[PDB]
Structure 1
Amino acid sequence: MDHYLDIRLRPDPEFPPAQLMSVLFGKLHQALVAQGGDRIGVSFPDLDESRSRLGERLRIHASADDLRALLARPWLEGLRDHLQFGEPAVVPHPTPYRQVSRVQAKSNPERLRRRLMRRHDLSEEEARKRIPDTVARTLDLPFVTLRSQSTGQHFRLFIRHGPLQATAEEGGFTCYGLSKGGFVPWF
């Protein structure tokens, strides 16, 4: 994708930057739900995989008309005191490419119990002996804490940046901006 926009979280005493990036990713998801499309990607160029931090930057990649459209929408109403804007410009050359993947886990055993007892009509003990409590997977990935609107549930979403490649291939994106085959330029 040719054009990128960098929005920086303004340093704020009233909330930590994790909460601002949470609400920014959430309103980003709501704006991408309102526009649709699968050619709109995200990246976080302030990565730090030692302490698993997401930093303070948000880089959204698409075309020119999409970015200049997303500037003038009410998904930036009520937030523009708390973040700074950049300019939609071309990605420089040359840059590597990588992905943004959502990596969940089956770290809750109880959902797997409910699944195995709802499809098979087992008992609690058969589901307990089939899958033990050691199935919980630990993760060292950065995460964003979003809530739900209609049936409200607050969850952390882990973001994984993939390996740096030399060329990018075609592919879509979700409403979260996450990679489904399409890679974002890393710089």
Structure 2
Amino acid sequence: FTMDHYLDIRLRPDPEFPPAQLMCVLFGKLHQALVAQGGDRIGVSFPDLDESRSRLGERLRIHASADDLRALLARPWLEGLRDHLQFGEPAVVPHPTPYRQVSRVQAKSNPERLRRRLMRRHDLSEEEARKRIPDTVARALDLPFVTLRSQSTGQHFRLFIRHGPLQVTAEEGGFTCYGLSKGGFVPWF
């Protein structure tokens, strides 16, 4: 109810990639721009999120402090995207901000990794380890994912993140490693 400094990031189109690859590379610029930058009370907000469309966002809405956003505008590590996307300026926030939920949460929709560690620890067989794990223990989470196709697996992958409910009261807290919610809400407008 006190962090009223926003830092928006408008996404323009480019012919060499869609918005999903720009959201993945900008996701790397956030994991290395915040995790390799510093500042716990700096979060991000995705305003084009839709759980029925599998989208991530059509315009970034950053939320930081006064100097937490006043010193990130002149970032030479924020270059490159100045030619690919567009920027803005600082603007005030309204009084009643709705308490929304946006953060990262990893789900375990695969029993093959726990079947590998369970084959190295439990000593399961083919039919005993294959039958000790039922088919209903795995599930695909249809949230807004990001194809973070980095140098761990060569093919395209998905993204996992869990959001929170909507509310009106303010409950602030410390941001996560990617500028999300982990016990503290964020405004959504």
Cα gap change, 1:149 to 1:2, in 2 (>3 Å): farther
Query: Which consecutive unaligned segments of at least 5 residues does structure 1 have?
Result: none
Cα gap change, 1:126 to 1:88, in 2 (>3 Å): farther
Q: Offset at 1:31?
A: 0.9
Contact 1:43 1:58 in 2 (8 A): yes
- What secondary structure, in the 3-state scheme, does the structure 1 residue paired with 2:81 have? coil
Query: How many residue pairs are counted as aligned between the two chains?
Result: 187
Distance 1:179 1:163 in 2: 11
Question: Structure 1 vs Structure 2: percent identity of aligned residues?
Answer: 98
Distance 1:89 1:128 in 2: 56
Partner of 1:124: 126
Residue by residue, what CA displacement relative to the aligned partner does 1:90-141 show, whole Å, maximum 9, x if unpaired? 2223220112132333222211201322333333433212212332212221
Query: Which consecutive unaligned segments of at least 5 residues does structure 2 have?
Result: none
Q: Offset at 1:159?
A: 3.2
Distance 2:152 2:90 in 1: 33
- What secondary structure, in the 3-state scheme, does the structure 2 residue paired with 1:4 have? strand
How high is the TM-score relative to the length of structure 1?
0.87
Contact 2:175 2:181 in 1 (8 A): yes
Contact 1:9 1:21 in 2 (8 A): no
- What secondary structure, in the 3-state scheme, does the structure 2 residue paired with 1:31 have? coil
Q: Runs of at least 4 residues of structure 1 off by over 4 A?
A: 147-155
Cα gap change, 1:141 to 1:76, in 2 (>3 Å): same
Contact 2:99 2:171 in 1 (8 A): no
Q: Tell me whether 12-21 or 30-39 shows the greater mean CA deviation.
A: 30-39
